[PDB]
């Protein structure tokens, strides 16, 4: 292949997919994450994996862009969820009930729609400058829930739908920002459809243990949800 930098948050590092690289520390970079799977299946990949659990756009700027340079051939990224406080939102939703959940989501969605686009530009501008020849793939987040059926979970239908809408919002904002820098956008709903929570075939962890894994892709989610989307953009 060649010089692949994989940036982003826990959906890119692979929190929830297991088999973590011990040196990544709290970044929780999984060898079963889509970037690690990509590198392991493309011969000769110089794989710079800087994605990190908990990362915001600011963390990408401060800690992750170091190996991004004129030599970079491929950049992947998921980022923006933590900026919008998704982890915090999910936690609140599963503890404080529907009203608090809906309020927290609304606040997150306001962030996504209003505040996030410029922060994405911050990151994408950096990629523009440092790695002008790199093919850049921005991957979205999956809608977390399949709606319409009975589902054995604590979040109400309303809460599920609201969280889905947040995903829809962030994916819309991100696809347009990505395209605005000439980056590819990888919509992971193309693969996660039929594999949301409540789908009967989840490729996401529900609210689970260890706590950090909740709402993140399973190993199957990384290998067949995220990775095929990266591969589709090559």
């Amino acid at each position: 292949a060649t010089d692949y930098v994989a940036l982003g948050d826990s959906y890119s590092s692979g929190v929830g997919a297991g088999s973590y690289d011990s040196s990544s520390g709290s970044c929780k970079r999984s060898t079963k994450s889509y970037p690690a799977l990509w590198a392991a299946s493309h011969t000769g990949t110089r794989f710079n994996f800087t994605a990190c659990s908990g990362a915001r756009t600011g963390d990408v700027l401060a800690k992750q862009l170091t190996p991004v340079n004129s030599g970079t051939d491929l950049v992947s990224i998921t980022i923006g969820g933590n900026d919008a406080g998704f982890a915090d939102t999910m936690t609140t939703c599963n503890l404080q009930g529907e009203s608090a959940c809906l309020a927290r989501i609304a606040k997150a969605r306001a962030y996504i729609q209003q505040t996030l686009p410029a922060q994405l530009d911050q990151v994408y501008d950096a990629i523009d400058s440092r790695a002008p020849a790199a093919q850049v793939v921005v991957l979205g987040y999956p809608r977390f829930y399949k709606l319409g059926g009975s589902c054995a979970v604590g979040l109400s239908e309303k809460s599920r739908a609201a969280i889905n809408a947040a995903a829809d919002d962030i994916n819309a904002v991100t696809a347009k920002r990505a395209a605005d820098h000439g980056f590819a956008f990888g919509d992971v709903n193309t693969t996660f459809a039929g594999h949301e929570l409540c789908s009967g075939a989840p490729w996401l962890h529900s609210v689970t243990l260890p706590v950090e894994n909740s709402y993140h892709p399973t190993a199957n989610g990384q290998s067949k949800g995220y990775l095929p989307v990266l591969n589709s953009a090559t």
Side-chain angles (χ1 to χ4, degrees):
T2 29
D3 292 280
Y4 171 32
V5 181
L7 312 166
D9 53 24
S10 47
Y11 287 74
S12 290
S13 80
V15 172
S19 298
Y20 309 106
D21 176 273
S22 48
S23 69
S24 64
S26 67
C27 284
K28 280 288 186 189
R29 286 187 285 267
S30 165
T31 67
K32 297 188 188 292
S33 67
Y34 70 87
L37 293 177
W38 195 94
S41 60
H42 289 83
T43 301
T45 302
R46 213 171 323 188
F47 179 43
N48 276 293
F49 195 10
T50 58
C52 196
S53 177
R56 285 175 163 72
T57 57
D59 302 301
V60 175
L61 296 173
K63 289 188 301 231
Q64 302 193 8
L65 296 173
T66 299
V68 177
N69 55 48
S70 50
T72 307
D73 298 279
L74 177 63
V75 176
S76 59
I77 188 167
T78 59
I79 199 68
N82 282 309
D83 299 76
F86 268 17
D88 186 282
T89 295
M90 301 325 294
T91 286
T92 286
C93 284
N94 282 283
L95 186 50
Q96 298 188 6
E98 183 186 75
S99 178
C101 182
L102 294 184
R104 188 62 191 86
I105 301 284
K107 167 185 170 182
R109 289 184 68 194
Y111 193 101
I112 293 160
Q113 300 172 10
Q114 296 164 23
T115 315
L116 178 63
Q119 298 183 303
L120 294 177
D121 281 336
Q122 283 186 301
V123 176
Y124 297 175
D125 282 345
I127 291 162
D128 282 334
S129 173
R130 304 205 203 182
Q135 290 289 59
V136 182
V137 189
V138 182
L139 290 89
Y141 300 90
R143 277 184 302 262
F144 285 167
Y145 291 103
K146 168 195 203 337
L147 304 186
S150 189
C151 189
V153 79
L155 255 51
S156 68
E157 182 67 14
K158 231 70 136 151
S159 293
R160 294 170 221 161
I163 283 144
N164 277 5
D168 286 354
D169 283 2
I170 200 161
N171 288 332
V173 168
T174 302
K176 313 200 326 199
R177 284 299 84 226
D180 216 45
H181 295 250
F183 304 161
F185 181 77
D187 178 6
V188 295
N189 287 316
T190 55
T191 50
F192 277 89
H195 298 287
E196 312 92 334
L197 295 176
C198 309
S199 67
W203 283 354
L204 302 163
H205 294 279
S206 188
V207 186
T208 191
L209 286 310
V211 286
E212 59 263 38
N213 284 3
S214 311
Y215 295 105
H216 286 80
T218 65
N220 200 358
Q222 285 290 341
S223 66
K224 281 143 66 168
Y226 270 88
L227 171 64
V229 178
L230 178 60
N231 271 332
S232 83
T234 63

Coordinates of all heavy atoms in Angstrom, one line a residue, residues 180-220:
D180 N -16.6 19.3 1.1 CA -16.1 20.7 0.9 C -14.6 20.9 0.9 O -14.1 21.9 0.5 CB -16.7 21.6 2.0 CG -17.0 23.0 1.6 OD1 -17.6 23.1 0.5 OD2 -16.7 23.9 2.2
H181 N -13.9 19.8 1.3 CA -12.4 19.8 1.2 C -12.0 18.7 0.2 O -10.8 18.4 0.1 CB -11.8 19.4 2.6 CG -12.0 20.5 3.6 ND1 -11.0 21.3 4.1 CD2 -13.2 20.9 4.3 CE1 -11.5 22.1 5.0 NE2 -12.8 21.9 5.1
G182 N -12.9 18.2 -0.6 CA -12.6 17.2 -1.6 C -12.3 15.9 -1.0 O -11.6 15.0 -1.7
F183 N -12.7 15.6 0.2 CA -12.5 14.3 0.9 C -13.6 13.4 0.5 O -14.8 13.9 0.3 CB -12.4 14.4 2.4 CG -11.3 15.4 2.9 CD1 -11.3 15.8 4.2 CD2 -10.2 15.7 2.1 CE1 -10.4 16.7 4.7 CE2 -9.2 16.6 2.6 CZ -9.3 17.0 3.8
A184 N -13.4 12.1 0.5 CA -14.4 11.1 0.4 C -15.1 11.0 1.7 O -14.5 11.2 2.8 CB -13.9 9.8 0.0
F185 N -16.4 10.8 1.7 CA -17.2 10.4 2.9 C -17.7 9.0 2.8 O -18.2 8.6 1.8 CB -18.4 11.4 3.1 CG -19.2 11.1 4.3 CD1 -18.7 11.4 5.6 CD2 -20.4 10.4 4.2 CE1 -19.5 11.1 6.7 CE2 -21.1 10.1 5.4 CZ -20.6 10.5 6.6
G186 N -17.5 8.2 3.8 CA -17.9 6.9 3.9 C -19.1 6.8 4.9 O -18.9 6.9 6.1
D187 N -20.2 6.5 4.3 CA -21.5 6.4 5.1 C -21.6 5.0 5.6 O -21.8 4.0 4.9 CB -22.7 6.7 4.2 CG -24.0 6.6 5.0 OD1 -24.0 6.3 6.2 OD2 -25.0 6.7 4.3
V188 N -21.4 4.8 6.9 CA -21.3 3.4 7.4 C -22.7 2.9 7.7 O -22.9 1.7 8.0 CB -20.5 3.3 8.7 CG1 -19.0 3.7 8.4 CG2 -21.1 4.2 9.8
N189 N -23.8 3.7 7.4 CA -25.1 3.1 7.5 C -25.4 2.2 6.3 O -26.3 1.4 6.3 CB -26.2 4.2 7.5 CG -26.2 5.0 8.8 OD1 -26.2 4.3 9.8 ND2 -26.3 6.3 8.7
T190 N -24.5 2.3 5.3 CA -24.7 1.4 4.2 C -24.5 -0.1 4.6 O -25.1 -1.0 4.1 CB -23.7 1.7 3.0 OG1 -22.4 1.8 3.5 CG2 -24.1 3.1 2.5
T191 N -23.6 -0.2 5.6 CA -23.3 -1.6 6.1 C -23.9 -1.9 7.4 O -24.2 -3.0 7.7 CB -21.8 -1.7 6.3 OG1 -21.2 -0.6 7.0 CG2 -21.1 -1.8 4.9
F192 N -24.1 -0.9 8.3 CA -24.7 -1.1 9.6 C -26.2 -1.3 9.6 O -26.8 -1.7 10.5 CB -24.4 0.0 10.6 CG -23.0 -0.1 11.3 CD1 -21.9 0.4 10.7 CD2 -22.9 -0.8 12.5 CE1 -20.6 0.2 11.3 CE2 -21.7 -0.9 13.1 CZ -20.5 -0.4 12.5
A193 N -26.9 -0.9 8.4 CA -28.3 -1.2 8.3 C -28.6 -2.6 8.5 O -27.9 -3.5 7.8 CB -28.8 -0.7 6.9
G194 N -29.5 -3.0 9.3 CA -29.7 -4.4 9.6 C -28.9 -4.9 10.8 O -29.0 -6.0 11.2
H195 N -28.0 -4.0 11.3 CA -27.1 -4.3 12.3 C -27.0 -3.3 13.4 O -26.0 -3.2 14.1 CB -25.7 -4.6 11.8 CG -25.7 -5.8 10.8 ND1 -25.9 -7.1 11.3 CD2 -25.7 -5.9 9.5 CE1 -25.9 -7.9 10.2 NE2 -25.8 -7.2 9.1
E196 N -28.1 -2.5 13.5 CA -28.2 -1.5 14.6 C -28.5 -2.2 15.9 O -28.8 -3.4 15.9 CB -29.2 -0.4 14.2 CG -29.1 0.1 12.8 CD -29.9 -0.6 11.8 OE1 -30.2 -1.8 12.0 OE2 -30.3 0.0 10.8
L197 N -28.5 -1.5 17.0 CA -29.1 -2.0 18.2 C -30.6 -2.2 17.9 O -31.1 -1.4 17.1 CB -28.9 -1.1 19.4 CG -27.4 -1.0 19.8 CD1 -27.2 0.1 20.9 CD2 -26.8 -2.3 20.2
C198 N -31.1 -3.3 18.4 CA -32.6 -3.6 18.2 C -32.8 -4.2 16.8 O -33.9 -4.5 16.5 CB -33.5 -2.5 18.4 SG -33.3 -1.6 20.0
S199 N -31.7 -4.5 16.1 CA -31.9 -5.0 14.7 C -32.1 -6.5 14.8 O -32.5 -7.2 13.9 CB -30.7 -4.7 13.8 OG -29.6 -5.4 14.4
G200 N -31.6 -7.1 15.9 CA -31.6 -8.6 16.1 C -30.2 -9.1 15.6 O -29.9 -10.3 15.8
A201 N -29.4 -8.2 15.0 CA -28.1 -8.6 14.6 C -27.1 -7.5 14.9 O -26.4 -7.0 14.0 CB -28.1 -8.9 13.1
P202 N -27.0 -7.0 16.1 CA -26.3 -5.8 16.4 C -24.8 -6.0 16.1 O -24.2 -7.0 16.4 CB -26.5 -5.6 17.9 CG -26.8 -7.0 18.4 CD -27.6 -7.6 17.4
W203 N -24.2 -4.9 15.4 CA -22.8 -4.8 15.2 C -22.3 -3.7 16.1 O -21.1 -3.2 15.9 CB -22.5 -4.5 13.8 CG -22.5 -5.7 12.9 CD1 -22.7 -7.0 13.3 CD2 -22.4 -5.6 11.5 NE1 -22.7 -7.8 12.2 CE2 -22.5 -7.0 11.1 CE3 -22.2 -4.6 10.6 CZ2 -22.4 -7.3 9.7 CZ3 -22.1 -5.0 9.2 CH2 -22.2 -6.3 8.8
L204 N -23.1 -3.2 17.1 CA -22.7 -2.3 18.1 C -22.9 -2.9 19.4 O -23.8 -3.7 19.6 CB -23.6 -1.0 18.0 CG -23.6 -0.3 16.6 CD1 -24.8 0.7 16.6 CD2 -22.3 0.5 16.5
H205 N -22.1 -2.5 20.4 CA -22.4 -2.8 21.7 C -23.5 -2.0 22.2 O -23.6 -0.8 21.9 CB -21.1 -2.6 22.6 CG -20.0 -3.5 22.4 ND1 -19.9 -4.7 22.9 CD2 -18.8 -3.2 21.7 CE1 -18.7 -5.3 22.4 NE2 -18.1 -4.4 21.7
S206 N -24.4 -2.6 23.0 CA -25.4 -1.7 23.7 C -24.7 -1.1 24.9 O -23.5 -1.0 24.9 CB -26.6 -2.6 24.1 OG -27.6 -1.7 24.6
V207 N -25.5 -0.6 25.8 CA -25.0 -0.2 27.1 C -24.4 -1.4 27.8 O -25.2 -2.3 28.2 CB -26.0 0.5 27.9 CG1 -25.4 1.0 29.2 CG2 -26.7 1.5 27.2
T208 N -23.1 -1.5 27.9 CA -22.5 -2.8 28.3 C -21.3 -2.6 29.2 O -21.0 -1.5 29.7 CB -22.0 -3.5 27.0 OG1 -21.7 -4.9 27.4 CG2 -20.8 -2.9 26.4
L209 N -20.6 -3.7 29.5 CA -19.4 -3.7 30.3 C -18.3 -4.4 29.4 O -18.6 -5.4 28.8 CB -19.5 -4.4 31.6 CG -20.3 -3.7 32.7 CD1 -19.8 -2.2 32.9 CD2 -21.8 -3.7 32.5
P210 N -17.0 -4.0 29.5 CA -16.5 -2.8 30.2 C -17.2 -1.5 29.7 O -17.6 -1.5 28.5 CB -15.0 -2.8 29.9 CG -14.8 -4.1 29.2 CD -16.0 -4.7 28.7
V211 N -17.4 -0.5 30.5 CA -18.3 0.6 30.2 C -17.9 1.4 29.0 O -18.7 1.8 28.2 CB -18.2 1.7 31.4 CG1 -19.0 1.2 32.6 CG2 -16.8 2.0 31.8
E212 N -16.6 1.5 28.7 CA -16.1 2.2 27.5 C -16.6 1.7 26.2 O -16.7 2.4 25.2 CB -14.6 2.3 27.5 CG -13.9 0.9 27.5 CD -13.5 0.4 28.9 OE1 -14.2 0.6 29.9 OE2 -12.4 -0.3 28.9
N213 N -17.0 0.4 26.2 CA -17.4 -0.3 25.0 C -18.8 0.1 24.5 O -19.2 -0.1 23.3 CB -17.4 -1.8 25.1 CG -15.9 -2.3 25.1 OD1 -15.0 -1.5 25.0 ND2 -15.8 -3.6 25.2
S214 N -19.6 0.7 25.4 CA -21.0 0.9 25.1 C -21.2 1.8 23.8 O -20.5 2.8 23.7 CB -21.7 1.6 26.3 OG -21.4 0.9 27.5
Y215 N -22.1 1.4 22.9 CA -22.4 2.1 21.7 C -21.2 2.1 20.6 O -21.3 2.8 19.6 CB -22.8 3.5 21.9 CG -24.1 3.5 22.7 CD1 -24.1 3.8 24.1 CD2 -25.3 3.2 22.1 CE1 -25.3 3.8 24.8 CE2 -26.5 3.2 22.8 CZ -26.5 3.5 24.1 OH -27.7 3.5 24.8
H216 N -20.2 1.4 20.9 CA -19.1 1.3 19.9 C -19.3 0.0 19.1 O -19.9 -0.9 19.5 CB -17.8 1.3 20.6 CG -17.4 2.6 21.1 ND1 -17.9 3.2 22.3 CD2 -16.7 3.6 20.6 CE1 -17.5 4.4 22.5 NE2 -16.7 4.7 21.4
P217 N -18.6 0.0 17.9 CA -18.8 -1.2 17.1 C -18.2 -2.4 17.8 O -17.1 -2.3 18.4 CB -18.0 -0.9 15.8 CG -18.1 0.6 15.8 CD -18.0 1.1 17.2
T218 N -18.8 -3.6 17.6 CA -18.2 -4.8 18.0 C -17.1 -5.1 17.0 O -16.9 -4.4 16.0 CB -19.3 -5.9 17.9 OG1 -19.7 -6.1 16.5 CG2 -20.5 -5.6 18.8
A219 N -16.4 -6.3 17.2 CA -15.4 -6.7 16.3 C -16.0 -6.9 14.9 O -15.4 -6.5 13.9 CB -14.8 -8.0 16.7
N220 N -17.2 -7.5 14.8 CA -18.0 -7.7 13.6 C -18.3 -6.3 13.0 O -18.3 -6.2 11.7 CB -19.2 -8.5 13.9 CG -19.8 -9.2 12.6 OD1 -19.2 -9.0 11.5 ND2 -20.8 -10.0 12.7

